[PDB]
């Protein structure tokens, strides 16, 4: 939804010292700076009518963007880094398990037996998880990208399969 000062200055403070640690590199310098931006960040947490609260905020973003480290540090496993989407090459969906060859099916029998009961609980709980979801769905479909749980008895939390059966973050 829309962003409010708290959500936004928390966003600000993330990037701000990400530049600062990348600016200073060595811990201790950035350490003294990071904790003093903290005081500099609370040096005005009592402002009057929200217009100034917004206007000073505008001054925060501009000096942030030109104080943004032009080459900032990004952790590789996260978006923008070396390891970002690196293992998506090894990512492979679960439906390739179904078309396994019968001779190869008998070479991994226990793992195919477990997928049989895993897809079994997929089917026997899919229809109940969805019917409950539509009846509890407010009119006009969903009002947000939320998901109802298995709040009742003997049910699975609706729309669980793909996110339960999501490929592991290190498919290797």
């Amino acid at each position: 939804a829309y962003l409010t000062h708290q959500q936004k200055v928390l966003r600000l403070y993330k990037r701000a010292l990400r530049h600062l640690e990348s600016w200073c590199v060595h811990r201790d310098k950035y350490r003294y700076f990071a904790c003093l931006m903290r005081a500099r960040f609370d040096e005005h947490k009592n402002e009057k009518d929200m217009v100034k609260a917004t206007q000073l905020l505008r001054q925060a973003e501009e000096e942030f963007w030109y104080g943004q480290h032009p080459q900032p540090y990004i952790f590789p496993e996260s978006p923008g880094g070396t390891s970002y989407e690196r293992y998506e090459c090894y990512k492979v969906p679960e439906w390739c398990l179904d078309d396994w060859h019968p001779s190869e099916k008998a070479m991994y029998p226990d793992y195919f037996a477990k997928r049989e009961q895993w897809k079994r609980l997929r089917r026997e709980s899919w229809e109940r998880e969805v019917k409950q979801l539509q009846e509890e769905t407010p009119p006009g479909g969903p009002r947000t990208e939320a998901l109802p749980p298995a709040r009742k008895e003997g049910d699975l939390p609706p729309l669980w399969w793909h996110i339960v059966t999501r490929p592991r973050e290190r498919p290797m």
Binding site: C24, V25, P70, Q71, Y73, Y87, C89
Partner: protein, 606 residues
């Protein structure tokens, strides 16, 4: 005669053997990485046997083992230019490859495609050393794309990464821009000198090779990553650190400049043609070394200091020094392989980290890689009795006293200072500084195979040229006596390259907010060059490919003029002539005027 050729021809044969076992899948998975390691290792040890022939005899000879076809007066044949340039490049090249791919299997160890990777390295040498052995320019071109399209595959080792696929696009694009001149040189050679053999090209004594050397100079700009087509190496680093160390450190980038030194009998014939070589080379060294002056990684600095170096060998041929360029690339591979080798060791030891500003205290925690990085920088930064002496000291002095443009000189001293500058900048951020890695302590090098691979190339990084200094015959015209100030400039430019980095390293030691400045960003984003070249021209041309191509011309205009309009005309006046009122009176009324016009107007009677 009996030896020499057959031995090295076996070398080409014997490491092709791993490939057609791989297609036949006679390898048992994990055996193949060691299997190819062995074959490349003997491919080294056998390659010295032709080498030993060159130190004593010094003879060279060309083999034509097959004839492809005869285009009337042009009989394309499988001709190999086997010579000093060919034979000695062999052992240094694949021993470096043999050295690195060991560090690869330790690094590249989890991805289940080890074999697929390792064969991909195996065919990579096959295309390389056929370029240096090729005699007909067509065979050189075969290997020219052979490495190019295979760098695309190798840097695209992980299809999950879209930047890798993005990186390959400009890598092929800039390489393709280079080989246009290769085609232009081919076109000139096939029309004017009507030949393909390198030996034939030079021996015709084409003393006005303006268009060819323009093409070869363009060819280097892509392969050797000169100015304009530089940023593909800053793109190719995304490919795994081993293969990036294998390809884009000094092993296939030098192929482009090696092409000019191959063409040396006609490369330097035109004095003017030499001139813009110094021009193209100088701007690289200023630009690339500038980029490495600030780089928050451990890959860009090496690549830029290479492209700065690739901006020096062709400077020597720009001042009519082929072999001095040729020995430069040999030492180039000797230390630049390591700089990436140890850098990748940091990425493996310290979990997938590349930027300088995320790790400290690497001296005590990483002693051997510290020693390897120290000597590797020490080797490159012109130091007597190592790679720098016979190569970097020799080139700096040579361009200094030979006839050259003032700025062609000026960049070399500046860049060499910059090479001495950012080499210590990464050494500082590597070792000097408190640990900057996550509390989970996992940094290690106890793996002997990584340790072994380093020391097998250590002997190169400190000995290098000395093992072959007096062994190779002197092709360089010496100067002996000459003024002493610019002869020591190389040793001068190193020292203020050091402490300027040192004091700036101490600014990172100094507790103070260092203000952002254009100079720091200018170096980090390559002078904002990829920010426009990778964004502006491609957006405009392909947007034209959206509107001017389909919507304007093809889907509308050519389809409007002939098909739609003419079909409309048939459709438009059909109803004027087909649909009729049907009342009988007008039909015979129409018959009336038909009689007169037949009888009177044209008067078919007359």
């Amino acid at each position: 005669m009996n030896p020499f050729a057959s031995l090295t021809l076996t070398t080409l044969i014997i490491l092709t053997i791993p490939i057609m076992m791989s297609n036949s899948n006679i390898y048992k998975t994990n055996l193949y990485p060691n299997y190819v390691k062995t074959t490349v290792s003997y491919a080294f040890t056998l390659s010295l046997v032709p080498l030993l022939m060159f130190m004593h005899t010094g003879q060279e000879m060309i083999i034509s083992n097959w004839h492809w076809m005869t285009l009337q007066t042009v009989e394309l044949s499988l001709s190999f230019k086997m010579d000093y340039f060919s034979v000695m490049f062999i052992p240094v090249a694949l021993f470096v490859t043999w050295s690195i791919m060991e560090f690869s299997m330790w690094y590249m160890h989890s991805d289940p495609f080890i074999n697929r990777f390792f064969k991909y390295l195996v065919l990579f040498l096959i295309t390389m050393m056929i370029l240096v052995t090729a005699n007909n320019l067509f065979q050189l071109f075969i290997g020219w794309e052979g490495v190019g399209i295979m760098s695309f595959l190798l840097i695209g080792w992980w299809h999950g990464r879209t930047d890798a696929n993005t990186a390959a696009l400009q890598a092929i694009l800039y390489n393709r821009i280079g080989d246009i001149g290769f085609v232009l040189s081919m076109a000139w050679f096939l029309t004017h000198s009507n030949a393909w053999d390198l030996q034939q090209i030079f021996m015709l004594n084409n003393e006005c090779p303006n268009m060819p050397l323009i093409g070869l100079l363009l060819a280097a700009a892509g392969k050797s990553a000169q100015f304009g087509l530089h940023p593909w190496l800053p793109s190719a680093m995304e490919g795994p650190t081993p293969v990036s160390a294998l390809l884009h450190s000094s092993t296939m980038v030098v192929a482009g400049v090696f092409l000019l030194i191959r063409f040396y009998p006609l490369m330097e014939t035109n004095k003017l043609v030499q001139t813009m070589t110094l021009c193209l080379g100088a701007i690289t060294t200023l630009f690339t070394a500038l980029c490495a002056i600030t780089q928050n990684d451990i890959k860009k600095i090496v690549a830029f200091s290479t492209s700065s170096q690739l901006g020096l060998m062709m400077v020597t041929i720009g001042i009519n020094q082929p072999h001095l360029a040729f020995l430069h690339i040999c030492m180039h591979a000797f230390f630049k392989a390591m700089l990436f080798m140890c850098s990748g060791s940091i990425i493996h030891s310290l979990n997938d980290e590349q930027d300088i500003r995320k790790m400290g205290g690497l001296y005590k925690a990483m002693p051997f890689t510290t020693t390897a990085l120290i000597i590797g920088s020490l080797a490159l930064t012109g130091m007597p009795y190592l790679t720098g002496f016979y190569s970097k000291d020799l080139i700096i002095e040579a361009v200094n006293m030979s006839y050259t443009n003032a700025w062609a000189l000026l960049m070399t001293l500046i860049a060499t200072s910059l090479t001495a500058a950012y080499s210590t900048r990464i050494i500082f951020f590597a070792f000097l500084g408190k640990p900057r890695f996550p509390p989970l302590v996992l940094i290690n090098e106890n793996n002997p195979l990584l340790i072994n691979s380093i020391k097998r190339l250590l002997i190169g990084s400190i000995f290098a040229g000395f093992i072959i200094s007096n062994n190779i015959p002197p092709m360089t015209v010496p100067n002996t006596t000459m003024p002493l100030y610019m002869k020591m400039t190389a040793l001068i430019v190193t020292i203020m390259g050091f402490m300027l980095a040192l004091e700036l390293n101490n600014t990172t030691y100094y507790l103070k907010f260092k203000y952002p400045s254009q100079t720091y960003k200018f170096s980090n984003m390559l002078g904002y060059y990829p920010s426009i070249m990778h964004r502006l021209p491609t957006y405009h041309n392909l947007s034209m490919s959206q509107k001017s191509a389909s919507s304007l011309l093809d889907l509308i205009w050519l389809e409007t003029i002939l098909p739609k309009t003419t079909s409309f005309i048939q459709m438009k006046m059909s109803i004027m002539v087909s649909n009729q009122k049907g009342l009988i009176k007008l039909y015979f009324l129409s018959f009336l005027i038909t009689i007169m016009i037949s009888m009177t107007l044209f008067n078919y009677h007359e």
